[PDB]
Symmetry: C2
């Protein structure tokens, strides 16, 4: 028995970069990692193999801001490769970015 | 200008003794227009039409005392040290993380 609460969710159009190439809207969220107390995980809901969730410890990921509505994420190996996220609005993207940064500290 | 995120908390000025009253107030983080990529913390006034206090985030000490209790120590000259009590742990945590992410 463990525990894993959702800190923030946002939505973005997500494209794999290695595909060169359609983007699909996805919920991204940050939650407590139930395996590791004090730490956070990033989930991309339904984007894995059998529409499963992609999920990673936050420290295993590299996250960059390319512009106000464009982020990129680098998952650890084994995953989909570099992902591009395009935000509907800049203020949601920026709250998300700062939260990802704070959770990473 | 723009507002990154806001939260409400019951804010009590500690400088004023055990009996100064707590009021529910809005705190928020906004883009510092004079420092691209850095943020200001705003404590909005106790009623509409009041002065809002703002500080560069680096000018402040922000401490977490507990899952629903934080403490803000502004530079001298202002309202003095403030207790903030949150309506629940999740708002408090989301905000604490955001403050930590915003701080450089």
């Amino acid at each position: 028995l463990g525990s894993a609460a959702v800190l923030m969710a946002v939505h973005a159009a997500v494209r794999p970069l290695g595909a060169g190439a359609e983007a699909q809207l996805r919920r991204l969220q940050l939650s407590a990692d139930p395996e590791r107390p004090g730490r956070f995980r990033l989930e991309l809901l339904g984007a894995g193999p059998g529409a499963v969730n992609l999920e990673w410890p936050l420290e295993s990921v590299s996250y960059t801001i390319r512009g106000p509505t464009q982020h990129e994420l680098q998952p650890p190996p084994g995953g989909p490769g570099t992902l591009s996220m395009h935000f509907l609005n800049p203020q949601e993207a920026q709250r998300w970015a700062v939260l990802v940064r704070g959770a990473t500290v």
